[PDB]
Design an enzyme around this catalytic site. Structure first.
Site, PDB file in Angstrom:
ATOM      1  N   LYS A   1       0.823  -1.196   0.000  1.00  0.00           N
ATOM      2  CA  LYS A   1       0.000   0.000   0.000  1.00  0.00           C
ATOM      3  C   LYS A   1       0.867   1.259   0.000  1.00  0.00           C
ATOM      4  O   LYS A   1       2.071   1.192   0.253  1.00  0.00           O
ATOM      5  CB  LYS A   1      -0.920  -0.020   1.219  1.00  0.00           C
ATOM      6  CG  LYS A   1      -1.996  -1.088   1.161  1.00  0.00           C
ATOM      7  CD  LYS A   1      -3.124  -0.776   2.127  1.00  0.00           C
ATOM      8  CE  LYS A   1      -4.303  -1.708   1.926  1.00  0.00           C
ATOM      9  NZ  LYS A   1      -3.989  -3.091   2.363  1.00  0.00           N
TER      10      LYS A   1
ATOM     11  N   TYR B   1     -12.113  -3.250  -5.672  1.00  0.00           N
ATOM     12  CA  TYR B   1     -12.810  -3.514  -4.414  1.00  0.00           C
ATOM     13  C   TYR B   1     -14.317  -3.612  -4.647  1.00  0.00           C
ATOM     14  O   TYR B   1     -15.107  -2.793  -4.180  1.00  0.00           O
ATOM     15  CB  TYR B   1     -12.477  -2.434  -3.390  1.00  0.00           C
ATOM     16  CG  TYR B   1     -11.079  -2.535  -2.828  1.00  0.00           C
ATOM     17  CD1 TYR B   1     -10.735  -3.561  -1.963  1.00  0.00           C
ATOM     18  CD2 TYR B   1     -10.108  -1.599  -3.154  1.00  0.00           C
ATOM     19  CE1 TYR B   1      -9.462  -3.660  -1.444  1.00  0.00           C
ATOM     20  CE2 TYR B   1      -8.832  -1.690  -2.639  1.00  0.00           C
ATOM     21  CZ  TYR B   1      -8.516  -2.722  -1.784  1.00  0.00           C
ATOM     22  OH  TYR B   1      -7.246  -2.818  -1.267  1.00  0.00           O
TER      23      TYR B   1
ATOM     24  N   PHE C   1     -16.656   1.364   5.500  1.00  0.00           N
ATOM     25  CA  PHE C   1     -15.278   1.802   5.311  1.00  0.00           C
ATOM     26  C   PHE C   1     -14.919   2.068   3.856  1.00  0.00           C
ATOM     27  O   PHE C   1     -13.802   2.523   3.589  1.00  0.00           O
ATOM     28  CB  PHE C   1     -14.317   0.758   5.884  1.00  0.00           C
ATOM     29  CG  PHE C   1     -14.555  -0.633   5.370  1.00  0.00           C
ATOM     30  CD1 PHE C   1     -14.027  -1.038   4.157  1.00  0.00           C
ATOM     31  CD2 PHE C   1     -15.310  -1.534   6.100  1.00  0.00           C
ATOM     32  CE1 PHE C   1     -14.245  -2.315   3.682  1.00  0.00           C
ATOM     33  CE2 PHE C   1     -15.532  -2.814   5.631  1.00  0.00           C
ATOM     34  CZ  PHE C   1     -14.998  -3.205   4.421  1.00  0.00           C
TER      35      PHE C   1
ATOM     36  N   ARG D   1      -0.744 -15.169   4.497  1.00  0.00           N
ATOM     37  CA  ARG D   1      -1.687 -14.693   5.504  1.00  0.00           C
ATOM     38  C   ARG D   1      -1.041 -14.661   6.881  1.00  0.00           C
ATOM     39  O   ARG D   1      -1.203 -13.695   7.635  1.00  0.00           O
ATOM     40  CB  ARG D   1      -2.928 -15.586   5.522  1.00  0.00           C
ATOM     41  CG  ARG D   1      -4.034 -15.167   4.574  1.00  0.00           C
ATOM     42  CD  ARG D   1      -4.408 -13.716   4.791  1.00  0.00           C
ATOM     43  NE  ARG D   1      -5.781 -13.436   4.385  1.00  0.00           N
ATOM     44  CZ  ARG D   1      -6.334 -12.228   4.417  1.00  0.00           C
ATOM     45  NH1 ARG D   1      -5.629 -11.186   4.833  1.00  0.00           N
ATOM     46  NH2 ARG D   1      -7.591 -12.061   4.033  1.00  0.00           N
TER      47      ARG D   1
ATOM     48  N   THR E   1      -5.140  -8.495  10.723  1.00  0.00           N
ATOM     49  CA  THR E   1      -5.478  -7.315   9.935  1.00  0.00           C
ATOM     50  C   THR E   1      -5.352  -6.036  10.753  1.00  0.00           C
ATOM     51  O   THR E   1      -4.737  -5.061  10.308  1.00  0.00           O
ATOM     52  CB  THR E   1      -6.896  -7.446   9.372  1.00  0.00           C
ATOM     53  OG1 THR E   1      -6.950  -8.552   8.463  1.00  0.00           O
ATOM     54  CG2 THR E   1      -7.295  -6.173   8.640  1.00  0.00           C
TER      55      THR E   1
ATOM     56  N   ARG F   1       2.597  -6.176   9.387  1.00  0.00           N
ATOM     57  CA  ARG F   1       1.584  -5.205   9.780  1.00  0.00           C
ATOM     58  C   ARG F   1       1.965  -4.507  11.080  1.00  0.00           C
ATOM     59  O   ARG F   1       1.711  -3.309  11.246  1.00  0.00           O
ATOM     60  CB  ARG F   1       0.227  -5.892   9.905  1.00  0.00           C
ATOM     61  CG  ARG F   1      -0.347  -6.324   8.569  1.00  0.00           C
ATOM     62  CD  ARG F   1      -1.858  -6.274   8.571  1.00  0.00           C
ATOM     63  NE  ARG F   1      -2.410  -6.444   7.231  1.00  0.00           N
ATOM     64  CZ  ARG F   1      -2.986  -7.562   6.801  1.00  0.00           C
ATOM     65  NH1 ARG F   1      -3.083  -8.608   7.608  1.00  0.00           N
ATOM     66  NH2 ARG F   1      -3.461  -7.634   5.567  1.00  0.00           N
TER      67      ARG F   1
ATOM     68  N   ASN G   1      -2.780  -0.769   6.924  1.00  0.00           N
ATOM     69  CA  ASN G   1      -2.063  -1.946   7.390  1.00  0.00           C
ATOM     70  C   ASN G   1      -0.867  -2.292   6.509  1.00  0.00           C
ATOM     71  O   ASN G   1      -0.232  -3.332   6.720  1.00  0.00           O
ATOM     72  CB  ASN G   1      -3.019  -3.135   7.500  1.00  0.00           C
ATOM     73  CG  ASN G   1      -3.666  -3.495   6.181  1.00  0.00           C
ATOM     74  OD1 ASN G   1      -3.372  -2.900   5.146  1.00  0.00           O
ATOM     75  ND2 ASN G   1      -4.556  -4.479   6.210  1.00  0.00           N
TER      76      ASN G   1
ATOM     77  N   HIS H   1      -1.691  -5.895   1.514  1.00  0.00           N
ATOM     78  CA  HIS H   1      -2.974  -6.491   1.178  1.00  0.00           C
ATOM     79  C   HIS H   1      -2.716  -7.832   0.517  1.00  0.00           C
ATOM     80  O   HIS H   1      -1.846  -7.945  -0.350  1.00  0.00           O
ATOM     81  CB  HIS H   1      -3.800  -5.588   0.255  1.00  0.00           C
ATOM     82  CG  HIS H   1      -5.068  -6.218  -0.232  1.00  0.00           C
ATOM     83  ND1 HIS H   1      -5.091  -7.179  -1.221  1.00  0.00           N
ATOM     84  CD2 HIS H   1      -6.356  -6.026   0.134  1.00  0.00           C
ATOM     85  CE1 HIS H   1      -6.338  -7.552  -1.441  1.00  0.00           C
ATOM     86  NE2 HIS H   1      -7.126  -6.866  -0.633  1.00  0.00           N
TER      87      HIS H   1
ATOM     88  N   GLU I   1      -7.771 -11.662  -8.702  1.00  0.00           N
ATOM     89  CA  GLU I   1      -6.952 -10.462  -8.587  1.00  0.00           C
ATOM     90  C   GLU I   1      -5.707 -10.550  -9.462  1.00  0.00           C
ATOM     91  O   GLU I   1      -5.279  -9.545 -10.044  1.00  0.00           O
ATOM     92  CB  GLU I   1      -6.579 -10.231  -7.125  1.00  0.00           C
ATOM     93  CG  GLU I   1      -7.760  -9.816  -6.265  1.00  0.00           C
ATOM     94  CD  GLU I   1      -7.558 -10.133  -4.799  1.00  0.00           C
ATOM     95  OE1 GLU I   1      -8.434  -9.768  -3.987  1.00  0.00           O
ATOM     96  OE2 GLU I   1      -6.526 -10.746  -4.457  1.00  0.00           O
TER      97      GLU I   1
END
Lengths: 201, 48, 249, 52, 249
Positions: free
Chosen positions: A9, A49, A57, A85, A91, A105, A115, A118, A129
């Site tokens: 991000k 998204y 959110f 993960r 998260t 994170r 965070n 992704h 994706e």
């Protein structure tokens, strides 16, 4: 060996922490088969998204992901989805700091929604994706080659324009040489198709 | 099945003294051990 | 990519770090390193460092080697050292014994310039200055000798040769990109399996140049230029490691 | 590639063994030479007394 | 084995031939070469040469290519040229159309300083000085641009790329060991296929440095060190041509 999607991000990029994350990823056994630094626009982010689409959110989430360049990576590992993960950790950033420190994170992520990473949830979303961001990256040869699914895809594709192209080829009957027929049917398909429009100057 | 292709690739011989199967195997072994810079083009430029 | 480190490149990239040589000595090295290289059979011979002395005649030390083998799970470079007070004439730097090196370790302060001096230790022992100089040089060489990771590779007959297909160290602002020469290329031992605070790294990303400074031996510097893919190391100062390092960090 | 690593290590070990064998053969030859010389030195006085 | 010639090794090896640059300009070059390399999106950018003017403000000229492909039996490099009066700020050299490219070869004498000078030729034709400079650079590059043979190779998609396994040129004294840049790797065209007495090679066997000077263009030098495979070239002096070669030799 499975492939998962991941993205860094803007918060881990505006702080110049992308290369450290990449080196950590490579240190844990992952392999970055494809990487690309890019900058989503509002429409592209909203399309990406789609699962949220109006949740509480969503406004801030789509306003954040279009505030700077991000990185997109395709990681490869035998347990890539579950391992990645775990590597990202929980998260929520504060819950991450509390429970599992020394996770990406906890270290780079801050302030809730930022965070700093992704990842993909399940192989369905992973493949979706990956095809969304890397349209030409080959993968999943088993879920598309089923005779039933192959026949279904051919059925979805051929009635729109290929049958009409074959009918036009049979009716017009151009030169018996196969190359001219191939050229004519290719021109007909690239000229008559329901997906793309006709272009004129 | 794959057995047919495997049995076929070991009878065919190339310009080199070894079969095409063994040639490809040796090329992949060299690529994996050396890890060249631009590997895909190094296949046509360096390993074979 | 490079076959041998270039002296002018080393002096150009380490100018900021304070590792410098005089003009006369620079020209004399330029004209005299090849002569000593060809007098022996050494395929490689380069400037190793410049130790400071008390009279003012600094000791220029150069090292060379012919072939690089791998033996007992390590890269064993058979090296030969030479020293000089002026850049013109190079004299041999004889290797010392074991107990003589243990006694070497107890002499501190900069050694004087005259290679005919003798130090007195304790039954009394006489220690020549050249022995002390060789002891210090081999200590520093053993401690810190940096090359970028995987810049070398094994081959037939198991000789550590340069890796002409070296892609360049990825993430070169981190210590995982560099390794001691003695470490074998295949092994994952790098500059990060030693003490946590005895190496500093600065990096200029735009020019793509990395400088690695040794804190155990504050005179050892190394550069890696990624765009040209050229690396090199130098030592300037007396051969003393700062044992009081922890209070410094 | 694993087999290649193993074979390379074996070849290097073979060359080292050859070098060591040459060194030990030279040492044995030198020792036998010393034995012969010592035997001759021991023998000489009797020879010069009773067999010239 | 190198991928791009250094700007420091070239200035060091060509200093004797008078191919030198001012120290302030050298520092400015060291800083402002990567800036222009990134501002222009060029993977390769090196200093091509330095041309003298009627002022002290000589033109420093640097060339850089992004792609280099085989085309009709010619290794075509898509070169871009930049000029600068001082080492700091660079400007571009736009290519020249054929009419003015033929009306610029008749203008002789060493150039002025201001690149906004208009020469008047014979009705009167007005030609900019930048056009004349571009013509001279193009002529020198066509006549002279020299690299060692087999230093480039052809890959798939017909692109010329550096030969990473170039082991060096045996007999560096012979002109056969060197070729023009725009010669295809397969073709056996070298500098031997040029006029007999237009290239002088002086080779120091001891230091292993060969030096090739152009006699048709007196200000073009090219060094090739073989102990470490490093070759570079520079043009220093006015861009005029030496017509009467037969009398001089």
């Amino acid at each position: 060996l499975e492939k998962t999607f991941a993205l860094i991000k803007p918060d881990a990029v505006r702080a110049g922490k992308a290369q450290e994350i990449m080196q950590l990823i490579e240190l844990n056994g992952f392999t970055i088969i494809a990487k690309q630094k890019l900058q989503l626009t509002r429409a592209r982010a909203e399309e990406f998204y789609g699962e949220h689409k109006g949740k509480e959110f969503f406004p801030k989430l789509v306003n954040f992901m279009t505030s700077g360049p991000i990185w997109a990576l395709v990681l490869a590992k035998p347990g890539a989805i579950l391992a990645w993960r775990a590597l990202m950790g929980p998260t929520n950033v504060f819950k991450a700091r509390a429970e599992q420190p020394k996770c990406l994170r906890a270290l780079y992520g801050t302030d809730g929604t930022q965070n700093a990473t992704h990842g993909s949830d399940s192989p369905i979303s992973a493949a979706r994706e990956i095809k969304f961001f890397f349209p030409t990256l080959s993968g999943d040869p088993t879920i598309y080659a089923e005779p039933t699914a192959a026949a279904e895809y051919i059925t979805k594709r051929i009635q729109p324009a290929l049958a009409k192209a074959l009918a036009a080829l049979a009716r017009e009957k151009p030169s018996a040489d196969k190359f001219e027929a191939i050229t004519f049917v290719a021109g007909y398909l690239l000229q008559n198709n329901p997906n793309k429009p006709k272009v004129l100057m | 099945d794959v057995g047919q292709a495997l049995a076929f690739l070991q009878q065919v011989k190339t310009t080199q003294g070894a079969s095409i199967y063994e040639g490809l195997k040796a090329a992949l072994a060299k690529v994996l051990e050396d890890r060249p810079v631009n590997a895909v083009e190094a296949l046509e430029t360096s390993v074979l | 990519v490079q076959l041998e480190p270039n002296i002018t490149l080393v002096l150009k990239h380490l100018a900021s770090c304070g590792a410098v040589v005089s003009a006369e000595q620079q020209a004399a090295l330029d004209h005299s390193i090849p002569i000593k290289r060809i007098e022996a059979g050494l395929r490689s011979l380069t400037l190793w460092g410049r130790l400071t002395t008390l009279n003012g005649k600094d000791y220029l030390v150069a090292e060379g080697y012919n072939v690089a083998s791998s033996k007992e799970g390590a890269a064993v470079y058979e090296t030969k050292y030479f020293y000089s007070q002026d850049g013109a004439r190079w004299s041999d730097l004889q290797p010392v014994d074991s107990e003589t090196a243990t006694r070497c370790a107890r002499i501190k302060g900069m050694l004087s310039g005259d290679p005919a001096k003798n130090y007195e230790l304790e039954l009394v022992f006489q220690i020549p200055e050249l022995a002390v100089l060789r002891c210090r040089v081999d200590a520093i060489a053993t401690a810190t000798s940096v090359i970028p990771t995987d810049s070398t590779i094994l081959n037939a007959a198991s000789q550590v040769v340069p890796n002409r297909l070296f892609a360049g160290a990825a993430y070169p602002e981190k210590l995982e990109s560099y390794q001691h020469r003695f470490s074998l290329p295949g092994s994952g031992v790098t500059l990060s399996q030693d003490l946590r605070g005895t190496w500093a790294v600065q990096y200029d990303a735009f020019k793509g140049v990395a400088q690695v400074r040794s804190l155990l031996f504050p005179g050892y510097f190394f550069y890696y230029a990624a765009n040209e893919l050229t690396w090199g190391s130098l030592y300037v100062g007396d051969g003393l490691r700062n044992n009081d390092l922890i209070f410094m960090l | 590639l694993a087999a290649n690593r193993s074979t390379l290590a074996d070849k290097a070990a073979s060359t080292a063994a050859t070098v060591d064998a040459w060194a030990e053969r030279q040492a044995k030859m030198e020792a036998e030479l010393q034995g012969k010389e010592l035997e001759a030195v021991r023998r000489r006085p009797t020879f010069v007394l009773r067999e010239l």
